[PDB]
Design a protein around this ligand. Structure first.
Ligand SMILES: [O-]
Ligand SMILES: [Zn+2]
Ligand SMILES: [Zn+2]
Length: 229
């Protein structure tokens, strides 16, 4: 299944959807995998999250050129940490329109990230304000509340059974909630549950640091997060 392409791994999840995976050494924790998504929408490609680095992100674009060979219309990144936004410069060098939560763009410089070009804003209920996500096609963007970070966002893919929780969601066999350095411990559980409620039909849950799983990823993550309160 997996396709090794340089130092990255690509996995097809559905007819028009692939997972990208890249790795960074976290001294004291090992080589940490981070996953994002690639979606073909007709004659264009949409990306969710960069790789950890500019070089790795350029490799994602190389893989897309080889395996899909259509223009990348836009990328959306799911918060201002390196695993999700570290390759912003590579996207910009490639001429790709980039989007992030307004709060992610605000936080980007202090987090050592380059901001996206465009800011998403959200209604009180968490759904993206449609004017701020033009031409997103099947990507349905939802802010579930603060959890892994204050700015974490999530993405459903219309026409598929897939929803992407980014670093908010861990798989059903995870022992912990990972790096909580920037987490909102009080609200994490409710935010994980809100993600599930936003995408009730999604049977395949994709996330940053585990392989795709069932919705038990959501229930298990939320149940673990109940212990943070
Ligand atoms: O992260
Ligand atoms: Zn993060
Ligand atoms: Zn992460």
């Amino acid at each position: 299944g997996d396709q090794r392409f340089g130092d990255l791994v690509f996995r097809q999840l559905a007819p028009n959807v692939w997972q990208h995976t890249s790795y960074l050494d976290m001294p004291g924790f090992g080589a940490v995998a981070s996953n994002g998504l690639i979606v073909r929408d007709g004659g264009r490609v949409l990306v969710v999250d960069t790789a950890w680095t500019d070089d790795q992100t350029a490799q994602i674009l190389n893989w897309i050129k080889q395996e899909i060979n259509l223009p990348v219309a836009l990328a959306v990144v799911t918060h201002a940490h390196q695993d999700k936004m570290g390759g912003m410069d590579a996207l910009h060098a490639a001429g790709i329109a980039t989007y992030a939560n307004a709060l992610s763009n605000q936080l980007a410089p202090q987090e050592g990230m380059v901001a996206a070009q465009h800011s998403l804003t959200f209604a009180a209920n968490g759904w993206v304000e449609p004017a701020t996500a033009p031409n997103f096609g099947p990507l349905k963007v939802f802010y579930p509340g603060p959890g892994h970070t204050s700015d974490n966002i999530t993405v459903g893919i219309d026409g598929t059974d897939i929803a992407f929780g980014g670093c908010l969601i861990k798989d059903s066999k995870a022992k912990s909630l990972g790096n909580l350095g920037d987490a909102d411990t009080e609200h994490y559980a409710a935010s994980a549950r809100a993600f599930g409620a936003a995408f009730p039909k999604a049977s395949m849950i994709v996330m940053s640091h585990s392989a795709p799983d069932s919705r038990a990823a959501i229930t298990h993550t939320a149940r673990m997060a109940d212990k943070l309160r």
